[PDB]
C-alpha cells in the first residue's frame, strides 16, 4: 500500500534515503496489536482514530486530554492519516495533567497498571507501550519501566530534549527498554535531542504533523514525537510476525538504516528506524 503526500516522517521510515513523500507499508497495518499511550490522555472521539482509540485509566479528575500532547503522540502511532500502524488498537492512560506535568509515583503507577491491564484485553499480535515523557534520574522510575518490559510489553521511551547525555534522565537511562532519539528531515540529529551510549535508535522528531485536540491538527517537535514512530513500527512488525515484544527493539536496530545521520557524537549509535517494505 502507499500513502502519497505523507508527513515527511512516515515517508522517511519506509525509505533508504531522505527527501521522499510517499509512505509505503503492508496493508495489515498493525491489526491485531495494541499500543498503550501513557501521556496526557487521548481525544478518542477524533475522526482520525476511526473509533480505534479509548481511555482506560486516568489519575486525575477527568480522562479527557486537555493538553493535546497525548493526542498528538497517539496520532503518530495509529491515526489514519498521520500514523505508522493505521489499524492498531490504541489505549490511553492519563498520568500527566493538562499542563503536561506529573509526579513520579503517578507515572510508576501507570506503568504497573498497563502490565496488569493487558491481561484483560484481546491483543493476539502483541502489546506496545509508548512513553513520551521523562525527567531527572530515578532508579524507581527505571525499575518500573524494566518491570513493564519484562512482563511482555514492548516499551519505547523518549531520550529527552536537553541536548545532553540521556544517562542522567529517567526512564531514558533504563537499558532494558527502547530509548528513542530524534532526527530532522535532512537526516541531522535534532538540535535538542539527547544522545549517549544508552540510546538504541533514532526516529523523526522535528516538525511532526499529527492529530490535536478540538478535532484539529498541528506540527510540533521533540523526542516525544520520535518515540511513537518507533512504538508504531514495533506494533506493525509484530503483526507481520517478524519479531516479538522481547526482541522488537533489537530487531529494529538490526534492520535500521545505518550511517545515514549527521551530527551524531562518538559513542552514540547511527541507526534510523526503517520498515524494510518491498511490494
Ligand atoms: Ca541511506
Ligand atoms: Ca535499550
Swiss-Prot record:
Positions that bind Ca(2+) 2: 16, 260
Top enzyme category: hydrolase
One Gene Ontology biological process: proteolysis
Cofactors (names): Ca(2+)
Domain Peptidase S8: 7-279
Residues annotated as binding Ca(2+) 1: 175, 177, 200
Active site, renumbered: 39, 69, 224
Cellular-component GO terms for this entry: extracellular region
Function: Hydrolyzes keratin at aromatic and hydrophobic residues.
Family: Belongs to the peptidase S8 family.
UniProt-recorded name of the protein: Proteinase K
Provenance organism: Parengyodontium album (Tritirachium album)
Amino acid at each position: 500500500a502507499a500513502q502519497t503526500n505523507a508527513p515527511w516522517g512516515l515517508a522517511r521510515i519506509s525509505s533508504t534515503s531522505p527527501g521522499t513523500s510517499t509512505y509505503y507499508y503492508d496493508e495489515s497495518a498493525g491489526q491485531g496489536s495494541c499500543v498503550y499511550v501513557i501521556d496526557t490522555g487521548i481525544e478518542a472521539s477524533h475522526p482520525e482514530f476511526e473509533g480505534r482509540a479509548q481511555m482506560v485509566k486516568t489519575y486525575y479528575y477527568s480522562s479527557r486530554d486537555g493538553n493535546g500532547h497525548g493526542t498528538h503522540c497517539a496520532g503518530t502511532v495509529g491515526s489514519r492519516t498521520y500514523g505508522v500502524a493505521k489499524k492498531t488498537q490504541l489505549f490511553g492512560v492519563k498520568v500527566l495533567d493538562d499542563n503536561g506535568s506529573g509526579q513520579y509515583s503517578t507515572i510508576i503507577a501507570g506503568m504497573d497498571f498497563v502490565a496488569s491491564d493487558k491481561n484483560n484485553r484481546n491483543c493476539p499480535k502483541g502489546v506496545v507501550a509508548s512513553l513520551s515523557l521523562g525527567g531527572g534520574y530515578s532508579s524507581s522510575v527505571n525499575s518500573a519501566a524494566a518491570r513493564l518490559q519484562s512482563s511482555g510489553v514492548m516499551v519505547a521511551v523518549a531520550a529527552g530534549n536537553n541536548n545532553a547525555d540521556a544517562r542522567n534522565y529517567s526512564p531514558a537511562s533504563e537499558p532494558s527498554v527502547c530509548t528513542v532519539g530524534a532526527s530532522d528531515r535532512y537526516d541531522r540529529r535534532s538540535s535538542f535531542s539527547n544522545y549517549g551510549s544508552v540510546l538504541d535508535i533514532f526516529g523523526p522528531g522535528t516538525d511532526i504533523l499529527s492529530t490535536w485536540i478540538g478535532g484539529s491538527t498541528r506540527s510540533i517537535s521533540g523526542t516525544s514525537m520520535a518515540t511513537p514512530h518507533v512504538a508504531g513500527l514495533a506494533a506493525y512488525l509484530m503483526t507481520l510476525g517478524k519479531t516479538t515484544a522481547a526482541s522488537a527493539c533489537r530487531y529494529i536496530a538490526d534492520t535500521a538504516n545505518k550511517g545515514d545521520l549527521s551530527n551524531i557524537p562518538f559513542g552514540t549509535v547511527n541507526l534510523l528506524a526503517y520498515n524494510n517494505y518491498q511490494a
